[PDB]
């Protein structure tokens, strides 16, 4: 699974002493954060546990 | 390949374990986050 | 925001060429764009040399974008602490006789889709002439 | 494939001169302005975008498998060589072979 956004943190010093992280800017591979799966060790598998179904 | 594109999405207001209460903020994370895990069973409902 | 080119003028055939801009005004370790060179022969038009940046994603160590026609012999650098830009070709020939241009290149860099896409000269040095 | 410039433009001044880019697009579509044992100027990216201080009477556009610059109110410093850019395949950057103005 993957987060292609290398973003930055502007904290802000909302004291008095102490500290928040706020969300800085969003740069880079502007795309959805997504999880790669292999389909065919899915299907297998799958297949494995409805037989004991 | 084949392969399978399961679309996320990000929060950073969570609640546990069900609790109601109270709530924990996540702070971003800087930079590009990847990782890789095992999945090693299902919980499921009939 | 200032480039200014600098290296040997005259190289000898089958030399490897090294070629410096200096940056001031900006930072080159900046997510902001690419950098590289333009080389126009005399007499000619503009031809892209080549150009890179260290804004790392997850899979690499930076971007590298190289010319197909002249990849063969060509090696890019840059100098983080000091704001430089490298240009090494490798074994220079007559034919590769140009006025040589730091460019820094402005396009769908900071933000981008799949992969950066620069574009455009976003600010230019003043040239070199180089010969063998 | 490569941007393709007739080799000259020219008119009087307060007249106004439309230059072709044939090469297709893309929106990654620029001008440059040069001056002889001068440098390249960016006049005009993203098509329609002139960077500060480009004059108000540059502009561009495009269709099909040509760009155009138009050069309004043309006067004595007008008189320059232009090169057309466009962002080709994956990274390619190509220049086009230049037309050279005289106003």
């Known amino acids: 699974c993957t987060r292609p956004n290398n973003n930055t943190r502007k904290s802000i010093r909302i004291g008095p002493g102490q500290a928040f992280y706020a969300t800085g800017d969003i740069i880079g591979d502007i795309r959805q954060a997504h999880c790669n799966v292999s389909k065919a060790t899915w299907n297998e598998t799958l297949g494995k546990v409805v037989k004991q179904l | 390949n084949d392969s399978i594109t399961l679309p996320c999405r990000i929060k950073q207001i969570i609640n546990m374990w069900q609790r109601i209460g109270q709530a924990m903020y996540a702070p971003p994370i800087q930079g590009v986050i990847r990782c890789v895990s095992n999945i090693t069973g299902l919980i499921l409902t009939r | 925001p200032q480039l200014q080119e600098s290296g040997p003028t005259l190289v000898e055939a089958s030399e490897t060429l090294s070629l410096t801009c200096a940056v001031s005004?900006?930072?080159?370790?900046?997510?902001?764009?690419?950098w590289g060179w333009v080389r126009q022969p005399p007499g000619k038009g503009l031809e892209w040399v080549g150009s890179?940046?260290?804004?790392?994603?997850?899979?690499?160590?930076?971007?590298?974008y190289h010319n197909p026609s002249l990849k063969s012999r060509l090696t890019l650098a840059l100098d983080t602490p000091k704001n430089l830009v490298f240009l090494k070709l490798n074994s220079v020939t007559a034919a590769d006789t140009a006025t040589y241009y730091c460019?820094?290149?402005?396009?769908?860099?900071?933000?981008?889709?799949?992969?950066?896409?620069?574009?455009?000269?976003?600010?230019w040095g003043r040239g070199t002439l180089v010969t063998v | 494939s490569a941007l393709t410039q007739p080799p000259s433009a020219s008119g009087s001044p307060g007249q106004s001169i439309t230059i072709s880019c044939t090469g297709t697009?893309?929106?990654?579509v620029s001008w440059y302005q040069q001056h002889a044992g001068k440098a390249p100027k960016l006049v005009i990216y993203?098509?329609?975008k002139r960077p500060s201080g480009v004059p108000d009477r540059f502009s561009g556009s495009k269709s099909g498998n040509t760009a155009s610059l138009t050069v309004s109110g043309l006067q004595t410093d007008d008189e320059a060589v232009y090169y057309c850019?466009?962002?080709?395949?994956?990274?390619?950057?190509?220049f086009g072979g230049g037309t050279k103005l005289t106003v």
């Open positions: 697009s893309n929106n990654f």
């Open positions: 850019g466009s962002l080709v395949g994956n990274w390619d950057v190509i």
């Open positions: 005004g900006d930072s080159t370790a900046a997510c902001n764009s690419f």
């Open positions: 993203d098509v329609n």
């Open positions: 460019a820094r290149f402005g396009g769908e860099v900071l933000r981008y889709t799949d992969w950066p896409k620069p574009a455009w000269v976003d600010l």
């Open positions: 890179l940046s260290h804004c790392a994603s997850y899979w690499n160590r930076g971007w590298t």
